């Protein structure tokens, strides 16, 4: 990648990673973010305060950033927040050592100072763990629990989403205690309000849904990418355009063709025949006359969505579905989902593992913002299934370690002494990532947070109370992190930065 | 078209190439040995003690650099070695005299000087050429390992010289040309892949690797009998011309089948007649030689008259139309051995053929397939010594004072032969002393004053036989140094070199196209 | 074309030699770092292995040729010393260049190198002791071996699994591991981890509930040319061409499936009884869900996707024979695996064929979520094993961590070569080239290299205490003490490639372009 050299990657590319990584947290992380416009090769305005998205929405021009970008993603994997953390925190890690270089402190030397401290962190981490809360059937406990993660990644409604997002994951598995990486596949539907966004379950086809409901109770489907446009391998679908008479004649044969089609599926049984392909006129009205449910123009996503929940496979060929190829759902029915009429399947006692939260608004950005938020809620649910542990929100938690980490550095010495106390500095950037996102200074806060001096309820969040920096109790605020997420957060950021600290510049043939 | 060129401009470009040609190898030549690297346009290193390599591999500088690789291959053919010598000697001899003498301005008095130094070479050579006995493979072995150690190899010097000793004697022309001048066609060199020097068998004759390609063929039969065509192969090579159909897949095949079936019946006419070998100089076909190999008849196929001719006398095989048709015989034994010796499953049939014209393709064995080449080269220039010492037991002690051995005798004759020619003679008197002094300059110390002391030692004590050591730079006996220089090599490299110099002296104009 | 001459022909050689060599000093020892080379793949390679980054991407140099030559064999011979083989010659050269910079012969300065390496090889032979094949004894080496190769925490975390691999050897004769390397890779939640498994493991398995988890009596049917065919050792053809052909093709597959599963199940019926003994077919392609189910209810353990190389170690582990069909077979060809197990960690189904009749193999499941991790943490395994195996492969080992380094340098007594300074100078750059091993380690930490190094000598200048740079702290240690020890193959061989390539420099006095 880089023919470039001259002690560049260390003194230079590493901070540029932090550059790319900063402000994508520091004004994007907190009780809220502050919007970051993005236009992909798919050209549209994408507002992302979520670390993972905007990172992947940008394309890495570094070997440097290339490494730790995943450390922020794997957090969204592992946690669902503290991804902006890895942006700021791991971004706040090495730029310290940028001094150590000009301080005349080596790489392999000062890594150790950073190395041992994550343990000391991971050793301090269980301390400031503040109580804990778990009921996987609580929407309420989980609502405030999903708050901290959506907050950082959502400028949209924190509480009502927390009411919606802690609904579905609790609602789709009512039991829970077993939770799927994807237990909720939101059905994104534009229109009405972001409040019109609601919580449904099972599968939803927002795609064109036709025929008619002959069973709202029974949901049986053979999921197909096969066109009923006249694509079937039973007979040979053959469209003849060579003469207008030929066109008219096959359409007549198309009635009996579709009679070989949606019949053959409901021959195995079916209600919705899930059609990822196309349906022509004589076929449509036949299946309308055959009175099978045709959801039409199904894209691969709703397939990939529905393909998992029923256990059936979308077929580009039309055949009568085998047991494997015919899906069943709890119930298939037409309900306005967030008050827009589309078909909504039911999988809950089906084993569920798909909730459909209709994500709404009058613009995609409304439907996209919560889309950034809801998964953090989906994420922290499993983070809840893993540990019940509550550790308060960001910016209160860091100061307690740092003070110890600093006194730890005091007990550290040997030339990594301050290299540990550097790690002690990587802490305060998180409340600063809130304070900067708020618009006041952490030095004040740091002054205050070591003035008020206690550590783990004392933090300023994104506020209009942040005119003057004003501390709130994170555990108490309804902003509730966990041990793991922080323990995950520290880990990768401590992991990815010290190893990109170990890099050299690239020789090229 | 219409063109004219001038003199020193064309004369200096000679040296301009000739010098650079002469340069790095004189550090590569002799015990002091260096790598002449080429940077490929491709960017790769090519590291040689040989100039022709880097020369050939790169842009050809027209007047001089085109000339020498030729006289190199002229020299490389002569004794087998000394391309490096010729190319450096000429450019050397082409340098100091010329401009000096060409500011004195004359082609010709320079030309006569080339011969006199080349003559002052000859005599004091053959004067100080030390006869070393061929009756002793030893007194060959002492000098034969000496010229296999020329630059980088003391290793294969042991084995390859062993192979070369009696081979050169065994090497014969087919005129009974002797065999002291013997070529590397009659010495023939084919390295045989794999095996090891412990596996090495001494083949003083030829290997016919065509002879046994499969165990079906005659093997370990003392001497073959090669039946050439003419009856045992009756004559039909043709085919019956069956119809062809592009429709059927089989009709394309059956026409080609009918072509091989007649030699199949010619090789069948061979089976009953029962040769041990059939040489088919027109050759045989694929399915036919199966029939050949039925009767234990090895087929030497599509082979020239002479390969058979030499091998026939070499392998001791008659030349007949048919075992029941008698012109009688060529030779029943030229070969005291038939060895079929295999590395891999391809049988390399090594037949040691006593004093036969043959190929004398001499079995040589490296530790692997690859280093066989150097062994061959170590075997080639080992034969060089033998053929040299078989030619002239006289050769000169070496380590480089041989190059002085002429140089100072020139200085005396410059004062003796005199004329105005002394000045070319004196200007060519200088050329021969840079090369050993370079070996001694590769040694450094004072390579200059030592050579003057050598130049003393030349006339003081000894011209060459007591010389200077090339990797040392002390007064040494080039006989006691054990580095022996073939007399003929001196007759060759110098001679060949002076001529390209006379050549590039002769041509002061080069028109292109 | 372009000829580079003399010191110009020398410069870029030693210039591209030492400088690029100097580029690499972030590494070599646990105080060394990783070095990032992004290949043309855009791959992030952070490596402390010298052998690696040479060939991958290296700034174009003619010198980039010979460096790729020597350190290859260094990883080939030992597996370590490769990160070492870099830093010797430049030191040697930077020191040697002076004499040439002082106008002395690369020729003569060559000859002190060659002369000096002996007494160090002697010293290596002298300063070594037998360091036994005991794992713990090899740990200290494996600890340290991977250190010169890679990072300590990575050098450490493998050292557990490392010597265990060479512990299971059969009295295998190799300096390196072949079959003890079974590389399984999983995307993990731990970047650096490796699951060490004895014997072969199969890349993927096939799990079924009726399919036996751990099969202690396992008659191994290796399988190929799968259920899609009907009692055929040859893979037949398919028609997917037309959407209609795809439909009529895949229905007969059941019968093709039916044959083999039948042939399978009744093969269990012969040898195993009905379900009475465990049984394993290993279907090295997919297993069709019928036979996936039908072999499972049979009692057979049907394994999906074993590699052809998994096939290779497969029948040796169970001591049986491979079959390319699913079909009734002589019971001997069914291999008996004292254990066939299948382990699913995440997505991958790891078949454990254990109690391998030949424990020629063990299995290393490489972990990382990230490529560069999965890339690199694999890398340390591969060189170190080869290195560390030398600790068991050679009962002799020799101290690492600088302990021996200052000793030969002290013992060299450069004036003892009195002959010229051919030797006496070339030995001087030698003791210099020796100590680059403590240098970079004393370098990479605080102080200086010398500042600690000059201790190391003055420390071991008190003789008999073999002292070196403490690997990480760049400060003195005795490497014999902890057992931090570089392979008898590491240290003995290393000087050889070092002396020759820097000599190759000195033998190139010209590079043409």
A233 in reach of chain C (CB within 8 A): yes
Helix (H), strand (E) at residue B22 = helix B7-28
Mutation target vs C (from B23, B24, B470; most C CBs, 10 A cutoff): B24
What's the number of CA atoms in the CB half-sphere (13 Å) around residue C353? 41
Q: Phi first, then psi: what are they for A225, rounded to 5°?
A: -90, 5
Look up residue B433 and give its DSSP letter.
Answer: G
Cα B184 off chain centre by: 6
Which has the closest alpha carbon to C3: B510, A507, A172, B20? Answer: B20
Which has the closest alpha carbon to A493: A111, A81, A92, A123? Answer: A92
Q: What token pair was written down for B139?
A: 């007194």
What's the number of CA atoms in the CB half-sphere (13 Å) around residue A75? 34
Q: What is the 3-state secondary structure (H, E, C) of C151-216?
A: CHHHHHHHHHHHHHHHHCCCCCCCCCCCCCCCEEEECCCCCCEEEEEECCEECCCCCCCCCCCEEC
Of A236, A495, A503, the CB nearest to C191: A495
A507 in reach of chain C (CB within 8 A): yes
Q: What token pair was written down for A229?
A: 């446009």
* Contact (CB<8Å) C46/A499: yes
Is C81 within any annotated ligand binding site?
yes
Residue with tokens 């195993």: C272
Shortest distance, CA B40 to any CA of chain C (angstroms) = 6
Judge whether C47 counts as a catalytic residue. no
* Contact (CB<8Å) C512/B442: no
Distance, CA of B384 to CA of B251 (rounded, Å): 58
In chain C, the N- to C-terminal Cα span, in Å, equals 6
Of C1, C5, C504, the CB nearest to B35: C504
Longest dimension (CA), chain B: 94
Which has the closest alpha carbon to C121: C398, C481, C386? Answer: C398
| Active-site residue identified among B48, B76, B84, B493 | B84
C283 touches C206 (CB < 8 A): yes
- A472 pairs with which residues across the strands? A459
**Neighbour subunits, B (≥3 Cβ pairs < 8 A):** C
* Contact (CB<8Å) A502/C57: no
C83 touches B62 (CB < 8 A): no
* Contact (CB<8Å) B38/C107: no
Of C34, C57, C58, the CB nearest to A502: C34
B83 touches B489 (CB < 8 A): no
Which has the closest alpha carbon to B22: B81, B70, B88, B72? Answer: B88
A340 burial (CB, 10 Å; 0-12 / 13-18 / 19+) is: middle
Q: What's the reported resolution, in angstroms, to a tenth?
A: 8.3
Distance, CA of A213 to CA of A331 (rounded, Å): 11
Q: What is the 3-state secondary structure (H, E, C) of C332-357?
A: HHCEEECEEEEEEECCEEEEEEECCC
Is C148 within any annotated ligand binding site?
yes
Q: Are 3 or more Cβ–Cβ pairs between A and B shorter than 8 Å?
A: no
Q: Phi first, then psi: what are they for A19, rounded to 5°?
A: -55, -60
Which has the closest alpha carbon to B152: B401, B365, B381? Answer: B381
Which has the closest alpha carbon to C343: C487, C152, C195, C236? Answer: C195
B15 in reach of chain C (CB within 8 A): no
Between strands B394-397 and B226-227, the pairing is unpaired
- Alpha carbon distances (Å) from C229 to A181, C226, C253, C284, C300: 38, 6, 7, 14, 19
B132 touches B393 (CB < 8 A): yes
Judge whether C83 counts as a catalytic residue. yes
B454 touches B404 (CB < 8 A): yes
Order of strands across the sheet that contains B35-39: B45-48, B35-39, C508-512, C3-5
B404 touches B458 (CB < 8 A): yes
Measured at the alpha carbon of residue C107, what is the angle toward residues C106 and C110, in degrees to the nearest 5?
75
| Active-site residue identified among B48, B76, B83, B411 | B83
Between strands B226-227 and B319-320, the pairing is parallel
3-class SS shares of chain A: helix, strand, coil, % to 5: 45, 10, 40
- C46 pairs with which residues across the strands? C36
B43 touches B70 (CB < 8 A): no
| Residues written for chain A | 509
Q: Phi first, then psi: what are they for C468, rounded to 5°?
A: -150, 175
Chain A residues with beta carbon closer than 8 angstroms to that of C42: 1
| Residues written for chain C | 513
Judge whether B84 counts as a catalytic residue. yes
Annotation: binding site of B? 30, 81-85, 150-151, 399, 470-471, 485, 490
Q: Which residues have CB under 8 Å from B123's CB, separation 6+?
A: none
C3 in reach of chain B (CB within 8 A): yes
- Alpha carbon distances (Å) from C7 to B447, C103, C106, C508, C511: 20, 10, 11, 11, 11
**Least CA distance to C41: which residue of chain A?**
A1
Chain B residues with beta carbon closer than 8 angstroms to that of C511: 37-39, 45
**Least CA distance to C103: which residue of chain B?**
B444
Shortest distance, CA B441 to any CA of chain C (angstroms) = 9
Q: Phi first, then psi: what are they for B501, rounded to 5°?
A: -65, -50
Residues belonging to chain C with any Cβ–Cβ distance to chain A shorter than 8 Å: 20, 23, 26-27, 30-38, 42, 44, 46, 53, 56-60, 64, 151, 189, 191, 243-244, 246-247, 369-370, 372, 444-446, 472
Residue with tokens 């020398």: C10
* Contact (CB<8Å) A70/C370: yes
**Least CA distance to A3: which residue of chain C?**
C59
* Contact (CB<8Å) C444/A108: yes
Which has the closest alpha carbon to B122: B414, B439, B409, B386? Answer: B409
C254 touches C227 (CB < 8 A): no
Q: Which residues have CB under 8 Å from B260's CB, separation 6+?
A: B285, B286, B287, B288
Work out how many CB contacts closer than 8 A connect B with C.
63
Name the experiment that determined this structure.
Answer: cryo-EM
Q: How many C-beta atoms surround the C-beta of residue A300 within 10 A?
A: 11
Judge whether C259 counts as a catalytic residue. no
Q: How many C-beta atoms surround the C-beta of residue B494 within 10 A?
A: 27
A37 burial (CB, 10 Å; 0-12 / 13-18 / 19+) is: exposed
Residue with tokens 């002492």: B142
**Neighbour subunits, C (≥3 Cβ pairs < 8 A):** A, B
A419 touches A110 (CB < 8 A): yes
C513 in reach of chain B (CB within 8 A): yes
**Least CA distance to B444: which residue of chain C?**
C105
A278 touches A227 (CB < 8 A): yes
Measured at the alpha carbon of residue C180, what is the angle toward residues C176 and C186, in degrees to the nearest 5?
120
A503 in reach of chain C (CB within 8 A): yes
Between strands C300-304 and C279-283, the pairing is parallel
**Neighbour subunits, A (≥3 Cβ pairs < 8 A):** C
CA dihedral C11, C15, C17, C19 (to 10 degrees): 170
B50 in reach of chain C (CB within 8 A): no
Chain B residues with beta carbon closer than 8 angstroms to that of C508: 34-37, 45, 47
* Contact (CB<8Å) C511/B442: no
C5 in reach of chain B (CB within 8 A): yes
């Amino acid at each position: 990648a880089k023919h470039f050299s001259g002690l560049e990657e260390a003194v230079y590319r590493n901070i540029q990673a932090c550059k790319e990584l900063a402000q994508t947290t520091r004004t994007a992380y907190g009780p809220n973010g502050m919007n970051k416009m993005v236009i992909n090769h798919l050209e549209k305005l994408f507002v992302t305060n979520d670390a993972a998205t905007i990172l992947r929405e940008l394309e890495v021009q570094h070997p440097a950033a290339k490494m730790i970008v995943m450390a922020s993603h794997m957090q969204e994997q592992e946690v669902g927040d503290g991804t902006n953390f890895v942006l700021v925190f791991a971004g706040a890690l090495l730029e310290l050592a940028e001094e150590l270089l000009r301080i005349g402190l080596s790489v392999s030397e000062v890594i150790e100072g950073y190395e041992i401290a994550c343990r000391k962190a991971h050793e301090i981490l269980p301390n400031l763990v503040c109580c804990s809360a778990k009921n996987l059937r609580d929407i309420d406990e989980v609502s405030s629990l999903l708050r901290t993660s959506i907050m950082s990644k959502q400028y949209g409604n924190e509480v009502f989403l927390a009411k919606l997002i802690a609904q579905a994951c609790v609602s789709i598995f009512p039991d829970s205690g077993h939770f799927n990486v994807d237990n909720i596949r939101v059905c994104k539907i534009l229109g009405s309000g972001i409040s019109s966004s609601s919580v449904l379950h099972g599968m939803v086809f927002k795609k064109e849904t036709e025929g008619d409901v002959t069973s709202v109770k029974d949901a049986k489907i053979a999921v197909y990418s096969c066109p009923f446009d006249g694509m079937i391998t039973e007979t040979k679908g053959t469209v003849l355009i060579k003469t207008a008479e030929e066109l008219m004649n096959f359409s007549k044969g198309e009635e009996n063709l579709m009679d070989a089609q949606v019949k053959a599926i409901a021959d195995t049984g079916a209600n919705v025949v899930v059609t990822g392909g196309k349906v022509a006129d004589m076929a449509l009205h036949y299946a309308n006359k055959y009175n099978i449910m045709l959801v039409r123009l199904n894209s691969k996503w709703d397939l990939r969505r529905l393909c998992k929940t029923v256990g059936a496979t979308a077929l580009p060929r039309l055949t009568p579905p085998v047991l494997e190829e015919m899906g069943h759902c709890d119930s298939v029915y037409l309900s306005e989902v967030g008050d827009t009429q589309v078909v909504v399947f039911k999988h809950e006692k089906e084993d569920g593992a798909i909730s459909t939260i209709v994500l709404r608004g009058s613009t995609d950005n409304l439907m996209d913002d919560i889309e950034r938020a809801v998964d953090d809620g989906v994420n922290t649910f499993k983070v809840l299934t893993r540990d019940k542990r509550l550790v308060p929100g960001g910016g209160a938690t860091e100061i307690e370690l740092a003070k110890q980490i600093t006194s730890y550095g005091e007990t550290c010495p040997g030339l990594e002494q301050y290299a540990i106390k550097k790690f002690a500095e990587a802490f305060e950037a998180i409340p600063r990532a809130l304070a900067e996102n708020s618009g006041v200074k952490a030095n004040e806060v740091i002054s205050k947070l070591y003035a008020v001096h206690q550590e783990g309820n004392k933090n300023v969040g994104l506020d209009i109370e942040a005119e003057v920096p004003a501390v709130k109790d994170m555990l108490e605020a309804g902003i509730l992190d966990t041990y793991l997420g922080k323990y995950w957060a520290i880990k990768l950021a401590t992991n990815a930065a010290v190893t990109v600290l170990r890099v050299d510049q690239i020789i090229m043939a | 078209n219409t063109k004219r060129e001038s003199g020193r401009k064309v004369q200096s470009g000679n040296i301009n190439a000739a010098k650079t040609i002469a340069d790095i190898i004189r550090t590569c030549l002799g015990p002091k040995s260096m790598m002449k690297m080429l940077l490929d346009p491709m960017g790769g290193i090519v590291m040689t003690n040989d100039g022709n390599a880097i020369l050939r591999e790169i842009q050809v500088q027209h007047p001089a650099a085109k000339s020498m690789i030729e006289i190199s291959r002229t020299q490389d053919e002569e004794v087998g070695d000394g391309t490096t010598s010729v190319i450096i000697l000429a450019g050397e001899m082409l340098s100091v005299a010329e401009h000096f003498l060409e500011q004195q301005m004359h082609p010709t008095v320079v030309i006569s000087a080339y011969r006199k130094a080349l003559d002052d070479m000859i005599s004091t050579l053959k004067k100080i050429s030390i006869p070393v006995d061929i009756s002793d493979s030893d007194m060959m072995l002492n000098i034969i390992n000496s010229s296999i150690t020329t630059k980088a190899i003391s290793r294969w010097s042991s084995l390859a010289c062993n192979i070369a000793l009696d081979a050169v004697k065994m090497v014969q022309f087919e005129e009974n040309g002797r065999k002291e001048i013997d070529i590397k066609k009659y010495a023939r060199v084919e390295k045989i892949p794999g095996g090891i020097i412990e596996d090495s068998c001494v083949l003083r004759g030829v290997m016919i690797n065509k002879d046994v390609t499969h165990p079906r063929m005659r093997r370990y039969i003392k001497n073959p009998r090669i039946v050439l065509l003419d009856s045992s192969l009756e004559y039909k090579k043709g085919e019956s011309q069956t119809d062809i159909e592009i429709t059927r897949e089989e009709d394309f095949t059956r026409i080609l089948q009918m072509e091989e079936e007649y030699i199949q019946q010619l090789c069948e006419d061979i089976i009953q007649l029962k040769p041990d070998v059939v040489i088919t100089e027109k050759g045989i076909s694929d399915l036919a030689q199966h029939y050949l190999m039925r009767a234990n008849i090895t087929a030497i196929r599509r082979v020239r008259k002479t390969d058979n001719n030499r091998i026939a006398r070499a392998c001791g095989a008659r030349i007949v139309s048919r075992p029941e048709e008698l012109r009688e015989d060529d030779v029943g034994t030229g070969a005291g051995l038939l060895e079929i010796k295999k590395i891999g499953d391809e049988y390399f049939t090594f037949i040691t053929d006593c004093k036969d014209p043959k190929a004398c393709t001499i079995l040589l064995r490296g530790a692997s397939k690859e280093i066989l080449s150097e062994v061959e080269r170590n075997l080639q220039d080992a034969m060089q010594v033998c053929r040299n010492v078989l030619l002239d037991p006289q050769l000169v002690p070496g380590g480089g004072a041989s190059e002085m051995a002429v140089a100072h005798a020139l200085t005396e004759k410059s004062k003796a032969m005199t004329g105005v020619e002394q000045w070319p003679y004196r200007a060519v008197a200088q050329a021969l002393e840079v090369i050993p002094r370079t070996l001694i300059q590769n040694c450094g110390a004072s390579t200059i004053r030592l050579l003057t002391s050598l130049r003393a030692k030349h006339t003081q004590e000894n011209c060459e036989t007591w010389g200077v050591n090339g990797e040392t730079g002390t007064l040494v006996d080039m006989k006691e140094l054990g580095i022996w220089e073939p007399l003929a090599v001196k007759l060759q490299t110098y001679k060949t070199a002076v001529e390209t110099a006379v050549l590039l002296l002769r041509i002061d104009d080069i028109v292109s196209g | 074309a372009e000829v580079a001459r003399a010191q110009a022909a020398l410069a870029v050689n030693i210039s591209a030699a030492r400088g690029l060599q100097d580029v690499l000093r972030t590494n070599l020892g646990p105080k060394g770092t990783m070095k990032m080379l992004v290949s043309g793949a855009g791959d992030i390679k952070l490596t402390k292995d010298g052998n690696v980054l040479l060939h991958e991407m290296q700034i174009q140099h003619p010198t980039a040729s010979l460096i790729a030559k020597v350190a290859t064999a260094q990883d080939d011979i030992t597996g370590d010393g490769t990160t070492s083989n870099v830093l010797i010659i430049g030191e040697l050269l930077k020191q040697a260049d002076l004499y040439i910079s002082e106008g002395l012969h690369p020729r003569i300065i060559t000859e002190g190198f060659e002369a000096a390496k002996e007494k160090a090889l002697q010293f290596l032979e002298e300063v070594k002791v037998s360091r036994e094949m005991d794992r713990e004894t090899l740990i200290d080496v494996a600890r340290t071996s991977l250190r010169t190769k890679v990072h300590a925490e990575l050098a450490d975390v493998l050292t557990e699994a490392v010597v265990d691999s060479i512990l299971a050897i059969k009295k295998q004769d190799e300096p390196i591991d072949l079959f003890m390397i079974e590389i399984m890779e999983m995307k993990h939640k731990s970047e650096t981890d490796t699951s060490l498994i004895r014997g072969l493991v199969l890349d993927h398995g096939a799990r079924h509930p009726d399919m036996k988890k751990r099969v202690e009596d396992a008659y191994i049917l290796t399988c190929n040319v799968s259920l899609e065919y009907e009692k055929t050792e040859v893979n037949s053809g398919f028609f997917y061409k037309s959407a209609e052909e795809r439909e009529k093709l895949v229905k007969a597959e059941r019968k093709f499936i039916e044959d083999r599963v039948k042939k399978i199940i009744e093969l269990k019926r012969k040898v195993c009884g009905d379900s009475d003994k465990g049984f394993v077919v290993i279907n090295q392609k997919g297993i069709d869900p019928f036979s996936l189910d039908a072999l499972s209810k049979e009692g057979i353990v049907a394994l999906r996707r074993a590699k052809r190389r998994n096939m290779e170690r497969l029948t040796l582990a169970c001591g049986g024979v491979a079959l390319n069909s699913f079909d009734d077979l002589s019971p001997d060809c069914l291999g008996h695996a004292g254990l066939v197990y299948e382990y699913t960690l995440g997505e991958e189904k790891f078949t454990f064929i254990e109690k391998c009749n030949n424990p020629r193999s063990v299995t290393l499941l490489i972990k990382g979520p990230n490529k560069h991790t999965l890339t690199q943490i694999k890398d340390a395994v591969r060189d170190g094993l080869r290195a560390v195996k030398n600790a068991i492969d050679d009962g002799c080992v020799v101290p690492g961590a600088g302990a021996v380094e200052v000793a030969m340098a002290e013992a060299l007594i450069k004036h003892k070569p009195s002959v010229k300074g051919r030797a006496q100078l070339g030995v001087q750059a030698f003791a210099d080239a020796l100590l680059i091993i403590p240098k970079v380690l004393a370098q990479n930490s605080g102080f200086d290299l010398q500042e600690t190094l000059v201790k190391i000598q003055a420390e071991h200048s008190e003789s008999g205490q073999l002292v070196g740079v403490d690997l990480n702290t760049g400060e003195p240690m005795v490497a014999a003490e902890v057992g931090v020890w570089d392979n008898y193959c590491v240290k003995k061989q290393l000087l050889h490639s070092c002396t020759v390539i820097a000599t190759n420099i000195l033998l190139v006095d010209e590079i043409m372009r």
